Amino acid sequence: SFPKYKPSRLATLPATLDPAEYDISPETRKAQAERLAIRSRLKREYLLQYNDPNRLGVIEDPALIRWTYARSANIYPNFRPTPKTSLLGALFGIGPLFFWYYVFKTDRDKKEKLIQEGKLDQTFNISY
Amino acid sequence: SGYTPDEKLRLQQLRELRRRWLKDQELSPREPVLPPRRVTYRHSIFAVTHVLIPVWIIHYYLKYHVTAKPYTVVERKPRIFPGDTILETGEVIPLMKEFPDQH
Amino acid sequence: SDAPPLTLEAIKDRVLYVLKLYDKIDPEKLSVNSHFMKDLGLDSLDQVEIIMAMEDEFGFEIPDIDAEKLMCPQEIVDYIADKKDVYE
Amino acid sequence: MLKIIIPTTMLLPMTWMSKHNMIWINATVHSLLISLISLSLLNQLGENSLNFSLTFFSDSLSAPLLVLTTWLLPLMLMASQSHLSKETTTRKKLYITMLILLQLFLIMTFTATELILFYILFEATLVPTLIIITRWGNQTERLNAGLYFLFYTLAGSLPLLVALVYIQNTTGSLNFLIIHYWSHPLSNSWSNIFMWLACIMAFMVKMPLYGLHLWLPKAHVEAPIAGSMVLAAVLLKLGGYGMMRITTILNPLTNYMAYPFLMLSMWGMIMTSSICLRQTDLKSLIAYSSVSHMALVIVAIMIQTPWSFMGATALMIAHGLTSSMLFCLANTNYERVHSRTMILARGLQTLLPLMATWWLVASLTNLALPPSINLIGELFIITASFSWSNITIILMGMNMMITALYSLYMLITTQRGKYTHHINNIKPSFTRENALMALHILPLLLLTLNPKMILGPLY
Amino acid sequence: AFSAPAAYLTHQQKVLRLYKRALRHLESWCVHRDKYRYFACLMRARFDEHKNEKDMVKATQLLRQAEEEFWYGQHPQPYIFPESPGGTSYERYECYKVPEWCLDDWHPSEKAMYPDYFAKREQWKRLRRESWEREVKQLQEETPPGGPRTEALPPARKEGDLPPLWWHIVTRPRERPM
Amino acid sequence: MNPFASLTLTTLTILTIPIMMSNSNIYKTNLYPNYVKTTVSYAFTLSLVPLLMFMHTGQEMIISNWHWMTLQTVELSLSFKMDYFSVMFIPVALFVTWSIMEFSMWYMHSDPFINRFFKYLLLFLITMMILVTANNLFQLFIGWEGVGIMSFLLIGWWHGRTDANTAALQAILYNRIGDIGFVLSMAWFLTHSNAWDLQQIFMLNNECPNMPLIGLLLAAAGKSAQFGLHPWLPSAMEGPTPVSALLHSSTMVVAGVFLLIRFYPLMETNKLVQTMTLCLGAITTLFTALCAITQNDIKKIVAFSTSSQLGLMMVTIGINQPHLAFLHICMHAFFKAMLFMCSGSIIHSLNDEQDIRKMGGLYKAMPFTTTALIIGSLALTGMPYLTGFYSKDLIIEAVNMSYTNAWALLMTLIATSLTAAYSTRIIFFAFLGKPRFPPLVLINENNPLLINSIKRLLIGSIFAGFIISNNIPPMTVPNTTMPLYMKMTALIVTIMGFMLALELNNTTYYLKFKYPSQTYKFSNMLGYYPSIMHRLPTYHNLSMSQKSASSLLDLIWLETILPKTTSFIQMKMSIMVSNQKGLIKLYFLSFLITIMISMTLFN
């Protein structure tokens, strides 16, 4: 035996170490066959549109259009106010602002006090 | 395993077409048709137009514009050692305290 | 670079050279079109070792999918010529 | 000041009485001549101002903006000449008329001795931009973008008119000179707090502020190239000019009042620079970069120190030129590809080398590479913020890094790598486009020789 | 890279690929030639022991277990050929690969130079225009109904026919154009 | 009048002329690289004169020639400092660049864009001269950013390669991380000292506080590739070999160390920042040598050697010996540049092969590169009377004869051991064993350019240390007395490293194989630092930049608050108000209600 490799999010499982591949069944073979059939149909369509001499333009890719539209324009109509959405939005949109306001306010209060008592030694400070 | 016969035939035809294209990519001896139309010696001119000329401008620009303004070019006030004499004044720095010299 | 423009003759010569230094094959029986599985009685592992030798000889490695379906020296030469864009 | 205004007005009859195939030539030549005329205003004094008359004055804050506004029109005409080719003469003349009216409104806005006249012209600039966006726009969302752009502006600016008329009722004058000499402190009162908010939010919305920046990506993406140029180069600077003009009356209330805005901008520059990293659109990426730069300008104006004001002026000019160049480059790509998505057309350096050089220079000047005026404003604002508080630098640091990242990202996605195999309609770049990029970029590298010319009145 | 992929990998394909990877990584481990030869022969001998095994379940047990061993001792920095997908010169010359249709955009003053090349290119364009029109019908008639099942193309079967979808395979720029 | 200023400005000015002529016709011919090389050589031989004037007199000067913008009290001007550091570094850099271009004329013979390559090299040289001769912080920042941008352009020379672009963006990212501290230092100095000028800063800062020095240290760590920001230097080997030999080895990467040298009057007056610099240098040199002793790519090994030398340089800085660190910079330039010349010659002769597993017997197969690499390795290790010995021996003596950290001293000694280790590793795996390259032998050196370029740096790496050490004025107190065992510590450590690494490499011929341990895996994958730090943060950033900043707030909630709420409210109000069935019964009932309400409410 040898020490086991533990997969993670940023270091996935190796292709040859998946327990699923060794479990072969006729259903799995049919699934792979139809997957490659879809891939080959798409490849055939792309090459048919690609090789033609008459065509002199960018080939339009419905997958790319769907990707961009879903990323940009399909977000809000599918939004639902949810405790997860509400809490994450409130945190990520309010917490940093108040954190930085507190930090800067404390820093400026300390500086103002130090300049009131005058123990700040602002010699040669002429540009602001 | 191995190539299927249809794969063999397709590879043969594609490969002969590829060689024909590659052979067609060559140039004839007259292919670059260039249309002509106009309107120590190497190191002698270069040392003048790349060294002598640039230093003429910079020395003129430094001696006559930059040093015209105060504090633009500041030197180091070179070291003064005992026993030295100064051209401007002519006086001599007195020697040292004659330390005991041994080894 | 300063690399000489290798040709089909050089490719085939080097292929047959590597195959003749393969002691599992007697040199006088092999040929350009001689098969590997049947004409020389070589194992599939022997064929992939031949692929090893080819890759170490020409300085480039052939993908496994193309390599596993190469059974003749002639078609190997043709494939490598296609990869290297050899004219003659 | 009429020596500039009258030729701009005469641009309209000249355009409408032009021969059907000589409008572009006539417009570009006379626009360049008017720009040359505008150059006279740059010779400012260390004294008060260039008070031409009771209605218009000049300032070394107003003069660079006026020069940039005049210079932008020939570039907009050259950029618009391409996609308006299949268009009737009447509608092309209407487009040129709208551009001329926009220039005239901006020119009168930047001089504007009186605040109500400034507000009237400041809101008059809104109509030509709205019509350009909603008429000569390609997508179907140009109507929604125009609605957003109109209503954000008007919601911000309607309280400003009430505040201005109230201020004139109390003080007795809205004139800039009188206001500056007779400025009196504002007591920390609820009414004074709301007056401050009404005076500030109208200019805050147009920068725009991080909270109120939504209209800008829509308006920039959906507008034509001339609309995008005028929005990114000049229309965003109106808010900064208005704040610098109106902040004098606001003190000493600004210190307490400024914190919500200072925090919003310091976090929103990071947010928008980070948004730029994950974008599928060139125009949206440029819009968000503009939002980040204008958030920094907001910080500079709110700090309200001399170095802050000089940095804000320099950054406004530099950002205007750089963003106009970036939008022009994206439009040159779009006119060939018709997709306006970065990941589709790739490896354009192999096919268009000079255009790739232009891309590199534009991305470098957006990155604030020294000694460009972009970094001059960047560094002045950063130093002023550090003097304001030694912690701000950390945020500023992040911003700089993130900025560089997405800039080079935009340079790497579209120019480097392997060209898409299928696209074959990428024709060689025209002389017009190369001239457009050269005319965009040369003024920046000329101005870096004379930075004081764009450092504002506090130089 | 040239041949179309298969719907799956058989057991013998997997064992051959594992043999290839293991031998390459052992060569990476064994820098010197004699040491590599000795250990490669030892590994080949070990490999051949289970060659006549007939149990499929046992066959599944073999190699997959070996794969775990291979993963444990896989030489984290293996040798890669310079032009291979991990090599130091994998895509050095992709920036020099200019498409052919770009020549259609050359100025006539540029096309004045190299006239024979452009004449041959015109002949190629004529051949492509005819051959593509033939190929569309040929592929339409030869393709199975309901769409293709494997992305492999048939060869030409007539006399004047050309391989279907040939233009962008024959007209590759070069391996080292400049 | 005092030709020092005229000559020291003329060198930099004539360094720019080929950039001006880059638009001329000569740029379209094959004579452009020779033009640039001749210009560089003339610049070097012309800059040799101010060096002689300094050696004779010790003459120092400041040239503030052009007045830039002046803001209030502060004045910004084009000012050049020609101190000992500038007048000493300029000839060395010009000589190295001359050798690099002579080598590149042959190494880039088949590159279609060779004129642009030479132009890129000259631009980098000009920018580094600007950086070195800067008298104020703004000009120094100009050079700081220019060298970084030229490095970005040169690393991604082959823009069709994804990994080259990735490495260039990595270099930019790390340099911006350092730029943060640089900008912090500039802001602090302007605010407190009221100037960016070097003279004013020294004068008004008798006891420099922590913050500006921490900013300077952060910038130096960023640009010198210290342990915190190291991986970009090894990843920068994606560029052409001349680029790695000129920029990332001997001229550019000493920018941070040079910057810390420039501010040595303020460095010596603070004790904490000195300790941080010393510890950072020690950990960097240890980690980089540890990574080097186990690599297979020759370029990676030599780049890690460069990073370890930079760590040793900052160790020298931390013990308050800036001039000795400058001497180390000058000597390391020579011998490490020649080391890359040898490596690139090997790579080109083996048909672009960089792995040492495919190179065997080259001691006889290629002798001149062999002797050059041997001399370079000996100089790096520190052979008595060699160029390396003058600097590195004094480094070891000063670190040993100082009130320093015990751990830092131990790590420096171990780093010396590992330096010897990877030196003998390179020699053994590239020069001694049986050949392992492909059978088609294309080994050739008979080319005047390569031989001359290598032999010039050979003469340098032989005699420069001696001549420079005996020609420069004395600047520090010597360790003139020392224990005999502690005087020989450097030599005994070097010989121990030699013998132990040789013995460990000699066991590879044995016909026994075992799986690697955890230490070998840790050292081979670069401490696992490039893995985790290049996968965990970036993802965690990028995902957020899409999930929180882009979609959650910008696309949804900011949209929900102002516009969508207004639209919904106005829609509901309009629907409620306008939905009247047209029955005047209801209208007049409402009229009665409002009439009575008005009668009851408004009086």
Ligand SMILES: CCCCCCCCCCCCCCCCCC(=O)OC[C@H](COP(=O)([O-])OCC(O)COP(=O)([O-])OC[C@@H](COC(=O)CCCCCCCCCCCCCCCCC)OC(=O)CCCCCCCCCCCCCCCCC)OC(=O)CCCCCCCCCCCCCCCCC
């Ligand atoms: C005061 C008296 C002064 C005198 C002192 C004594 C004088 C000398 C006595 C000798 C002492 C040891 C010297 C031998 C070094 C070992 C060499 C060796 O056998 O390597 C093969 C062997 C494994 O080889 P392999 O896996 O079969 O590789 C397959 C092939 O060989 C693949 O081979 P390849 O062809 O791929 O490449 C070959 C390469 C590959 O070989 C390697 O893998 C290298 C890795 C180990 C060598 C590195 C040693 C440097 C130690 C510094 C560590 C700093 C602290 C790090 C802290 C880590 C914290 C976890 O090997 C080399 O090139 C040479 C290696 C470097 C040796 C030359 C210089 C070392 C001598 C100097 C050491 C100190 C003296 C300083 C002098 C000044 C006087 C004070 O390495 C080891 O077994 C490791 C031994 C020592 C490693 C220490 C780290 C253990 C950490 C465990 C955990 C500890 C607790 C931490 C808790 C922390 C929680 C907070």
Ligand SMILES: CCCCCCCCCCCCCCCCC[C@@H](O)O[C@H](CO[C@H](O)CCCCCCCCCCCCCCC)COP(=O)(O)OCC[N+](C)(C)C
């Ligand atoms: C959405 C995207 C961004 C949009 C723009 C946002 C920026 C505008 C936000 C305005 C900033 C704050 C407004 C008022 C600040 C006054 C200072 C106050 O916060 O501090 C304490 C005030 O205490 C409490 O804050 C009292 C007010 C509480 C009621 C305000 C609502 C709080 C949250 C509402 C936020 C919604 C804003 C958007 C509306 C559409 C001090 O106590 P006190 O000494 O007694 O009052 C001093 C002022 N005096 C002298 C005039 C009397």
Ligand SMILES: CCCCCCCC/C=C/CCCCCCCC(=O)OC[C@H](COP(=O)(O)OCCN)OC(=O)CCCCCCC/C=C/CCCCCCCC
């Ligand atoms: C998002 C913008 C920030 C919004 C912050 C607050 C939002 C909530 C307020 C909603 C609207 C409230 C309307 C009523 C406010 C009453 C304020 C007021 O009357 O002060 C007027 C004050 C004193 O009144 P007098 O009676 O004359 O003094 C005599 C005794 N001292 O005089 C003035 O300054 C007049 C100026 C007009 C005030 C502006 C009112 C609107 C709110 C301010 C603008 C902020 C919202 C901007 C919208 C942003 C969209 C882009």
Ligand SMILES: CCCCCCCCCCCC(=O)SCCNC(=O)CCNC(=O)[C@H](O)C(C)(C)COP(=O)(O)O
């Ligand atoms: C350095 C890194 C370490 C790597 C560790 C590697 C572990 C090696 C040990 C694995 C043990 C095995 O053999 S794995 C056991 C897998 N099962 C079988 O081998 C059953 C039938 N064999 C076949 O079918 C083959 O194809 C064959 C007949 C050989 C040729 O076929 P050809 O006739 O079609 O060429």
